[PDB]
Amino acid sequence: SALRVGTDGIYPPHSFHAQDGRGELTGFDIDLIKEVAHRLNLKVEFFETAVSGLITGLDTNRYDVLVNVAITPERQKKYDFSIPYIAHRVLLVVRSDQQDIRSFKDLTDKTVAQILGTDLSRFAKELKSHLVFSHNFEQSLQLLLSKRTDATMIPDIPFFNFLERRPHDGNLFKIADRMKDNSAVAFMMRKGNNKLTRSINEILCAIHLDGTYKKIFDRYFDKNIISSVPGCSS
Amino acid sequence: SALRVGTDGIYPPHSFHAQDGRGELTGFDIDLIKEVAHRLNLKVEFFETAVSGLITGLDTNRYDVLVNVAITPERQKKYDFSIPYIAHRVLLVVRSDQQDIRSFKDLTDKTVAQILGTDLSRFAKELKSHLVFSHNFEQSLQLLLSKRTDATMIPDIPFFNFLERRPHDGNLFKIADRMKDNSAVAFMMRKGNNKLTRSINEILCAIHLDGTYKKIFDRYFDKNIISSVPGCSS
């Protein structure tokens, strides 16, 4: 009788460990679901797995929520999302020196860092890019920096997180494209968790209504740069 | 076998009638659910009632969807919302001449136009305001203009709609307060329509992904002034 939350804890600021990776699990999503869990009156047990096994871990019932999941028609068929609680916009980031990559269409025939088992990996593959698989967003970016790849497609959130922690690197990159729309991020439960979904929804609304959402989002993102979703009424 | 959508058709640009109130039902929400309906492969039958009976009409099974419903904890207990498809921010509007209404707390002991049977009506009443009940947002505004009331709390959407249709009337007001957050607006179905909800959700995602949402929202609101929700991925 706890909320079994899957993550991979190497993705600041969503889900990372304090004290330079050595301490307790922390992050925007983590504090949120933990916050969610407390009001729902439930202990939380985490399970850190690699992203490539994340959804697996949910089909295979080894936990009940995933966090930081982009809403997708594909997933919306097979799963239940909570209400969106944050949004990302997907950037095509390159080295500032970069020349010929001006849109996603241009990723064909260039070398790209994407995280194996992610839609952006499947995208980069579709475009007939040359994939170099990273184990999270820090490495995706470090690979771009190390000339090992020419580009990566990464959300705004991790990528501006990176410009914070490592600010001298905030000049060594550039955004050469973003997606037309931004994308909703929601918790993801197996289909049928109808009951648990709505509770999450109610508590998220409470968390919005009483200032909590604002404290939590404020602890992690720059309000001028990352997009929140709408709040609740009453 | 059709999607029974309740509305009140005197609320531009959400749900109004073409040709100055003489023609077919039209509006942002209306086109959307109609659009939703077509993809879900369903005719749509409308039912115009007054706002005060709207939720009644849904408890009483005389229709299956309400549109332009603000999410609230209260309603989220008793109903199913779709994913949010737009947001409003609630303005405290007064005559430009006004001086002493600087916040919601200041509505106590002044005379307010709100629409009977609405949360904002219940708000104005709680604050110990002096209520003068309007039929819709146009009259609530016209009552403010006619000195019959000192203020109204109204969403941004209707109120900027009004400044559009009637630009000669659009300098004679001012915003003396808005709420902390903006609020999510969603379709509202009876509890249990679990299946229909998710479908609406899938189609809303499709409607986002392929530019539809953008055409529809563009026909009705100013993108710089009204808030959209986040889009979908893929």
Ligand SMILES: O=c1[nH]c2ccccc2n1C1CCN(CCCC(c2ccc(F)cc2)c2ccc(F)cc2)CC1
């Ligand atoms: O549809 C999309 N457009 C995208 C544009 C950019 C990046 C991903 C994008 N996706 C999805 C790609 C795969 N994914 C798997 C779930 C894990 C989720 C997560 C993250 C951290 C955590 F702790 C627990 C669960 C996650 C989110 C972003 C990721 F890059 C990788 C994995 C969800 C998002």
Ligand SMILES: O=c1[nH]c2ccccc2n1C1CCN(CCCC(c2ccc(F)cc2)c2ccc(F)cc2)CC1
């Ligand atoms: O939560 C909120 N904040 C508010 C600020 C002002 C007034 C009401 C506000 N309510 C609720 C109050 C009552 N109500 C019942 C249905 C009317 C609904 C509607 C309108 C037109 C239509 F065609 C179908 C259904 C509606 C939705 C948004 C509005 F701005 C006004 C009325 C739902 C929204």
